[PDB]
Amino acid sequence: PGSHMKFTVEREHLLKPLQQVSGPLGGRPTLPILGNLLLQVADGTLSLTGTDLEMEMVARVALVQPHEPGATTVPARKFFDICRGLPEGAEIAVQLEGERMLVRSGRSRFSLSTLPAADFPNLDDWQSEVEFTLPQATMKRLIEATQFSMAHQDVRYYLNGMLFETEGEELRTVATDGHRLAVCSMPIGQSLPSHSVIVPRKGVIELMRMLDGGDNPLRVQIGSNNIRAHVGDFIFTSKLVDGRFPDYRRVLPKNPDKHLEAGCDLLKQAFARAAILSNEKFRGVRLYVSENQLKITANNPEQEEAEEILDVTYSGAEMEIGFNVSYVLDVLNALKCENVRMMLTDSVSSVQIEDAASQSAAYVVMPMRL
């Protein structure tokens, strides 16, 4: 409630908020106002919001100095670049003048176009069904452990995102694209109701962006169709994805009978070298498992060939199996541990990969018929 919005703020109080709330913006222009940030002044607070219609990011900035309430929207990139370009310590005075938003500091003056705050989209009202609070580092671990396995544009649209699931005292993430799957769970120190929602892939990426890893805790609220995350002075809200996500419990290989264990770095570097001579599009490599040995081979349409032999721990029947080497490298890069375990069955069945020393995360990769 106010027609003459005005505030004055220190530059260093604005810069990180402006960067954060601009996260959802970018890409194809559609509705003009989506390239703008909503500014609202009231009762000691400046709020800044950016949206792409599917998600929204809000920052709150405490206002010390005399301010007058109101709201407008201004071009996000230009406003950020102006503030960032002012000198360290600058005081930034902002005020609406007619249909222009003025930004003043020193003898620098910028008159920006605006679009009406009344036109700025809102996410529909909704009610929270579960709420819990956890360290940022825990949420970062959960997402980093799994996010590479989300689909991008699968027709199975429930795959273009990440399952967040509460069970007992644990929060779990699951991501799969039909060809590989990642699951990770972490205790969060409170008894939770059971709930399973799919966060869109772009919202996963934005939630990750808001975690600086510091000690401001993450508060999560989940509704039937939305998720909200509060960290520090920021509030992120996203729509959820419809559909029945796959049950990871039924995707984990049943009773794999062949157990190989190898050094993570040695395995990763061998796959990385072999990948060089794999087909650029299909990426297939062949694994041959024999007593205490793994052989990896790759070839390409030019008939070039890579071969790597590694000493490993394996007792069991010999077998051969093909994989997309990118999927294997993605898992090994996410494990970052000393020894890996691969659990195999046969050449046409998935394999489970995990840290030999931890069960918090598990990975499943479906083979290729080479």
Binding site: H179, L181, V251, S350, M366, M368
Partner: peptide, 5 residues
């Protein structure tokens, strides 16, 4: 490439 489901 095979699928998990």
């Amino acid at each position: 490439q095979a699928x998990l489901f």
